[PDB]
């Protein structure tokens, strides 16, 4: 019995500005389940593969370089509609348009330094999860409060 | 109309997930006055009364059962437009639609486990207060900051 | 020993200064179980009974007036060593001696305005619970996290 | 860009100074200037000069002089417009949960905070409330992580 | 009456690490009254005046240079035993020895980067206040919760 | 220096991962490595090899395997000792308010977190739980504000 999953990465700026715990707490307190997590400096080639659909966009080389300029926190979270809801929690990709109460709305200013990534769709999420994690890094466990989050 | 009151109940899930203090802090920090509060397991019959308006709805049986499945924190809060503002603070009844920054937006996922109830109108508020509280349980006192919250 | 209980009251100053939610959160996050809670203005008659052991202290008259000067939040909390641990959480009865991280240490200054009471022993806790609550106001339920708080 | 933010007497009285500053700090804006004062009625009449002919102008000045305020200047990209977004709408009733006014107050006449409405007004307010030498220049250690 | 006052300065590291609001909130929530506050880069000669009792200690020269390396937030706070209690809230001057729950215990590591200063005596406080502030920068007002903080 | 910190299964289950990480970040320590896993019984037997002949050892391994843990490496000046001071005493009963155990748990057998007890223990734990390539070298933007 597996719910939907999404890929969330805290970008180098989110690590550098000391926001790792704050971000994780927002997912925990919502009732989502942490399925996987690792901390690494992703290679430029790995980042190009992650962002392959953006490869022709003028910002893509600077995006790859910045994403490689420090470590990221890569995560998989599980729950009902976690992909869409995760994006709502993160706020709009451009922080200018992110509302107060969202992660980007509370904590950052510019699109090129927008602290976090979340998958845009279930299919994107599955691709991203497979790119970043080995299957055995996805931990199956039951949340003690599951029956108080879900009917 | 600084004397308006609303009924707020923390549902069994909210209790079970450790959110009582967080929820009360949100109402205190906003400037609303706590008028009444108690902690109880509401009987089936009491809840049937409370939800008589929904009694011919498909989710009604399940709702009554969930609401009897642990204790609730029942409260009365006072202030200007507290009914409507209380509801904005809680977020949409359906957590899927509740925005980050709201109680449901921040803390829950599914409508059948939506942590909290607030009255939908002044008329419903007065009925709910009467059902859940004895008049002698309503405490009259003056907030020391009242003249800094209200002109 | 996991069934011990203690009586905690947030004093009139704790209510007036908007600390109810903060205080409850501290007990929730520690792992203790909320057994009972109500909000009331305690009568002089009632408070004389509560503070019976301090009846000949020079500060007793003033203490009784203060404690009747606004409502209090009365609570019962359950868990292993909750009486001793509750007092550690609260701090010393003089706030000036209470350490940062404690409730009194963080939030108040003077002994006469020391925001909170906790039972000093198991015997006094049982007396205080009986005085402030009817047995039917003590709610029995099991915390979903119980087996992760206790071995 | 720079904006003027003032925590009004009710914000100070209700113990929200730290909370409010933390919001601006955590967002990535740079604090440029800050002072705490009871603004004189004459200083406030200047601040509110556009309103001198309105019947509520005396009561407004009385209120704004009725306790101290924290006056600040913050710097960042779009900080004028974004500061307003962070404060919430001028009426707390319309301010969303997550905003300063939405989280912390109830009535338009006790709405805890002001921020400049435009770059124009900001430069006016900054010149009025601060001496140039009170605007401190420094670079945030996290600058390269807030801005590309 | 005028209660005791202390001088508190948030050092350039406190400002750079985004701790100004956190620090101010801890003094507000304790119940102390903010009397004066400004934000400035202090001159080396001003800083030598402030630390003149330490002028023969080997750390003194480096301390003056660091304190001039960015702006500070200078404050005056008032309340009962605010000098002594303020120092308890800050923690030991050496963060190595500062307890969790204190400002230095929670937020810093090394004595040369110890985020904050508080006066060590009432006489020191009066000297520091006069050094950093004009008499007219000290604001007299009455806290709305004063009678709930003090008997 | 570096230390090994693990959030135990009860800390994960009770929703304390973010809280705990924030405490280390806000102190000024640098996160060097982090992974989330159900540690295998053999892995845990190695971690607790000194206790293998004690009667409580099977129960301990069983508990530590009963849910996922967050394994971390943190760096900073005397981080081994100071990490232990931040966690509090090994019995939560004796842990003071403000510490992780003092704030968040009750019973010694459900004490939410481990930190290395010594620099030698830290080195052994880091080598057991992480590959060398999983220890990430970067410089904190605030480094010169945390250290002289």
UniProtKB/Swiss-Prot annotation, chains A, B, C, E:
Residues that coordinate or bind ATP = 11, 59, 87, 93, 104, 114
So what does this thing catalyse? a 2'-deoxyribonucleoside 5'-diphosphate + ATP = a 2'-deoxyribonucleoside 5'-triphosphate + ADP; a ribonucleoside 5'-diphosphate + ATP = a ribonucleoside 5'-triphosphate + ADP; ATP + protein L-histidine = ADP + protein N-phospho-L-histidine
Q: Which cofactor does it need?
A: Mg(2+)
Which residue ranges are recorded for the region named Interaction with AKAP13? 1-65
Q: Which GO terms describe its cellular component?
A: cell periphery; cytoplasm; cytosol; extracellular exosome; extracellular region; ficolin-1-rich granule lumen; lamellipodium; nucleus
- Keywords assigned by UniProt? Activator, ATP-binding, Cell projection, Cytoplasm, DNA-binding, Kinase, Magnesium, Metal-binding, Nucleotide metabolism, Nucleotide-binding, Nucleus, Transcription, Transcription regulation, Transferase
Q: Which residues form the active site?
A: 117
Instruction: Report the InterPro entries cross-referenced here.
Output: NDK-like_dom, NDK-like_dom_sf, Nucleoside_diP_kinase, Nucleoside_diP_kinase_AS
Location of this chain's protein in the cell: Cytoplasm; Cell projection, Lamellipodium; Cell projection, Ruffle
Record PANTHER family: NUCLEOSIDE DIPHOSPHATE KINASE
Role this protein plays: Major role in the synthesis of nucleoside triphosphates other than ATP. The ATP gamma phosphate is transferred to the NDP beta phosphate via a ping-pong mechanism, using a phosphorylated active-site intermediate. Negatively regulates Rho activity by interacting with AKAP13/LBC. Acts as a transcriptional activator of the MYC gene; binds DNA non-specifically. Binds to both single-stranded guanine- and cytosine-rich strands within the nuclease hypersensitive element (NHE) III(1) region of the MYC gene promoter. Does not bind to duplex NHE III(1).
Q: What is this protein called?
A: Nucleoside diphosphate kinase B
